[PDB]
Amino acid sequence: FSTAEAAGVKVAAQDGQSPISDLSVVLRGGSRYATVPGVSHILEKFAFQNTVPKSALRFVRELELFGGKLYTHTTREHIVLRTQFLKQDLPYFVDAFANVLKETKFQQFELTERVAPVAELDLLKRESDPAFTALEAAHEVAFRTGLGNSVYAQGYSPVTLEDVKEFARQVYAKQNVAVVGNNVVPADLQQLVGTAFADLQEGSKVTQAGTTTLHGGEARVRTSTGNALTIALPIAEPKPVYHALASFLGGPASMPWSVGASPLAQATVGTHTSVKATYHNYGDAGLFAITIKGDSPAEISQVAHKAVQALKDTGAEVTEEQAARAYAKSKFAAAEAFENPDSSASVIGMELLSGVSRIAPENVQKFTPAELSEAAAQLSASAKPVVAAVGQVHALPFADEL
Amino acid sequence: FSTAEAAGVKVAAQDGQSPISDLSVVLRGGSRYATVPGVSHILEKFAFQNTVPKSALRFVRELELFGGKLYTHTTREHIVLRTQFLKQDLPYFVDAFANVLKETKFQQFELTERVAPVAELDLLKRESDPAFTALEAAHEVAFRTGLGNSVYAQGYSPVTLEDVKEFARQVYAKQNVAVVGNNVVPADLQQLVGTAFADLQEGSKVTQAGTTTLHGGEARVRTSTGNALTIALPIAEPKPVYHALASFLGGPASMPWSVGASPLAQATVGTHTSVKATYHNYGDAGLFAITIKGDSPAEISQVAHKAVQALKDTGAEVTEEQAARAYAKSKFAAAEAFENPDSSASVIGMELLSGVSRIAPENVQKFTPAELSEAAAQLSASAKPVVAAVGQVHALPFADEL
Amino acid sequence: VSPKTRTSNLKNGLTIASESNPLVQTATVGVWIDAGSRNENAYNNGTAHFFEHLAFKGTDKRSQHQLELDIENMGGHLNAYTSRESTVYYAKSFKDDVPKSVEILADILQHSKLAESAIDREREVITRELEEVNKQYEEVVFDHLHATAFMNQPLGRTILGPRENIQTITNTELRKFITENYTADRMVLVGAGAVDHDALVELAEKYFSHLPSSQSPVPLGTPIPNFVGSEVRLRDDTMPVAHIAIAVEGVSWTSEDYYTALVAQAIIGNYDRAVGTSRHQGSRLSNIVSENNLANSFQSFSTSYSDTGLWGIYLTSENTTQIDDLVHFTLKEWNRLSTSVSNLQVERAKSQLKAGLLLSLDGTTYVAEDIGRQLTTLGRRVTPAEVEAKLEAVTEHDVRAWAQKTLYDKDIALVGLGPIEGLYDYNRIRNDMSMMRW
């Protein structure tokens, strides 16, 4: 991805040999920057609504003629708007993004009838998985605000048209916008962005209201639709070793009809439960989480104990074999993330919008058994453990039990 | 109240000079003894359903002919079933209670159509007050199980007919039953209970599954129906001084259109918020709570800070005047509790079932300023503060902020 | 313009096919086999799926545990799936972990233990799978759809097989199945992403050279199905969403009408109330359904097999009093493929498909799946230029002629699951397959 600048907008493109191009606008407008709860989700859903030059209806009918597709999502850091089309149709897509950022008519009926109902279905689909809920709850406990804001719009706190219009006034500005073009000729994209995004406001960098503060605690989301448990450990100094530790501890199987050779995978033997360790770097803080879902609260409780033990055991000693297995699983995870268009866009988006240089999968550091065990030791000896239980919460573990 | 025993059942009665009698059966079957969440609420609601001798319908039609009334409630300690009638109708009411305890047909249709829907309306009415929710949430955090069980049946944990029938098999037994008769001739009640409750099982004392354990923490209940905040402090050694401290700190006004002279009342000045300090003795543990409701989360937050300060200030110094004011407000609170038939019944019920000799309002101890300040000091410096926020929880305080 | 798919053969007749992409760092290698459940009879139905479980249960060298460890140490993962006509076993890895992954795949296919102890253990796991598919409503609907459309024929059988067979499958019949079916002339070794073709051919010569050849080598994707107009109703008043599939007999992979049927399918298209753009789609059915809240979703499909296919639509709806309208309007849109479609809809669908067929291939696993599917169904990878020409050859006359012989006044296979009281009887549904005004 050759990083450049076109009319004040950071543009990164990588040419390829495929008939398919992906163009993504990455906006610094994720939920950590959200003025009011849920506004970044609503703004994401308000992309490709009526603009002054082109109605939502006309856009969709013309997109069907190009056979293009549209993908949008919100993270804690970004809003990502991606289009996938044939290479030759690049100018149309650039101009479409320009219309969205410059000329969206944010109309009250779109919010009531189109945008908010779709945002609500989006969230309900995600929450069907109790593990999603548990990991969301864990961020809320760990960070409270900023990273602790909900990503998604909720019913209890309604977003108004004035909320969304104000946020868009901040976000849709040259200072908060990065363009990422996969299989796009880099010189051609710079020329097009340079003409189309010239009259976009300059604006100012959106910032998190307040510094990131870490907290421990418990969340007990009582649902009737499945059971899950997250054990998170907030990290004050995000370090790349936690990727290796996440992949080492593992949890999912690398093979059909198997349990797996990872410590966390082996904690689920004899139970219909699954586990996944994940590490979330947010630049200024991190979260190391272990999420366990299952149908039995008794089995979840059983696995949860084994999971925290596994982490303690790792803090004791890692073998050389296990450290190499961690390097391999971690390099692979890095590679596939840079391939997947959704995650790819945000990776270069972070490089462009912040200044965090991307770590190429081929440059992923190999951590010795000493470095891995040291990282696990810090986590086992955390002052601020977070536990989010979802489901039959009376039957799930508590932080002080773990 | 002359305590006696009639056919294995403890009977307490106090004759008076009024045409109206109150007969109450107090059962050791409150929510701390529950086997399944909400069963004690469901059992309470199943009182005066169809018995083998007399249908619910026939009972209600005959109760109307006597102009009697029926009152039932569940606490953490007891189920209380009270009837109010004319003095002369005593034998009918004794026999009615006997039919309920001996011969209730627990039929599935009553549970589905009658009992559970009424239990659900009962809860929804209580939860309309966010302060009720906050204080319930605080007990759940503080005790987890036993005293931490919910008092009321909830939708997420369905009580089955087998659950209720099992619990009733334990509770409806001579060992768990006390009869309390207000304005009932004590000799006459003993004779009637002795004939009517003779064939009731003896059974065994119902016990709390597990010892009472104290925990600190936070609960954050998102409602869209108003705002409240409880600051509770679990007490490992319940002492009578906390009654005096609750009444001293106060919170409600003692005259119309006024704020009040109590430290907590004075914390609300300039805000449309109310406050109430409460102390709950449960024999083996206690809870000292300060609950603040209001329409503004900002104002609640403001009062919450002043409330915690008030408690700290009390730990420093109380004047002689203030200690006497606490004795006065506390004697009065004791007197009116022994007067109200609802609370009266449970007070003697606790003396009969448990063995905790009642403290007469005239024998309420006067605490010196030293003893009061020491009690407040012990609370401000607790290792396990509980905070339950209800409403716009993102805008309400956290434990670590207080 | 994507890089050329290179293709080589071995002596046994194993095909090697690769498409390199120097922009990615991962590679998907695997074995596509032209064999699946359809190759079983009634007595060993379930064998192919049974084997898939045992393939990962240990080989003559590596035990179950060693297998797990070896893959964990590679860094990527292995995956497998058995369908009616196709079995796949692949490995996604890093660029330079490809020789390891080819070696593991060659081992689990050729040298699997199939130990009586493991057969007996999986026999319970698979028995539990019978009672948990029940939740995946789309799969329940499609399995009943095949069972009824191809009543008492091999394509009609499920992949899991009956409970009875699961209890009686022996290591003997497992071994017999994979010896008869997993032959070199039925197998394609595929690599996509960061693979060198010449390197992959060498790895094939090293690991897959002692594969049996079949006695009578037919070409890849070589097969008579007799479709039954029929219905299965699985009414369940407690479910909130109705799931309905309606299909007619469709087209095989090598039909001359293959592209015509895809264009017709694209004219009806898909719809999902949860997607923001779906209320603005051009499809008439989409507009009817969204304006009237008739459905949560619908998905047109055109499934092909070697010698038949199913063409139809899958609908989901909570609108339980207007299922009749939903089915009515759907079938009246199908009628219009016979009576009314012109160059307006046909050219719009062609535009959408020319991109759609290329867009689908957006990762190494998708590319490998495309090379493998095309090699095992058509015998070759069809270049995008050829595909663009075949789509361009579809006229409105072709669509009308196809719909008049395939849809118009034809029997349907219909499956309803859930609160389907409002779904009318077979005759009233089938009467909507024609229009009295035409």
Add this chain to the structure above:
Amino acid sequence: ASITSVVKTSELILKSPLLSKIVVPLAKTYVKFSGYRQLGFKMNDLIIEETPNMQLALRRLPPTESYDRVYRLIRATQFSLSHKLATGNDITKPEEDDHYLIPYILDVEAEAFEKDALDNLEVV
């Protein structure tokens, strides 16, 4: 006729100096003789509403405008059945006769007409 039609034709007239000079005074007198202001109506209260497009435009009115319209209709119905006219503040003054509904119906119709056009597009 569609509101779109009426609005476009009106704009052609209002552009032409000659046309506006002769049409605007006529239109003002017409409105005075029409007499809907004497029942406390605004012009837009009279537009036929039993149409999908109009039902959608009315649903998009801000709640305040919608509550006020309901009151004007009820009040006018009471004048009609009593055979009385509005007096005093109930009479709509020319400055109060605002086109509160026109922008909503124009947006509804814009989409409806674009949908019709796009349903007839021909790939070139």
Add this chain to the structure above:
Amino acid sequence: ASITSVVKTSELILKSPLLSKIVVPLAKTYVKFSGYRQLGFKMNDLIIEETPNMQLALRRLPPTESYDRVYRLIRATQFSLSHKLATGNDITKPEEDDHYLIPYILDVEAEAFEKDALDNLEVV
């Protein structure tokens, strides 16, 4: 007639030794000639249900009993329209002809009749 009536009269007969000796054999042949078992029905499936009392009793059936009744009615309807009889396991055997509904309807009617009585009470 009410189920209560039928059940009470039946109990009077079953009590009397003489009466039962002559009535029970008749009742058994009646049921054999009635032929409802040959359509796979249980006796209680035949009771008229289009009354408030019966609708309430049916709503109180346990879910499994209710699902099985629905199947017997559908199956019997299919035999009726085909002009066939049940064969094999579809025939109701005498031991399967259980009074699954009688206790529910007797409870519903007990309350309904007590309500009628109590609506006519006279304070003495």
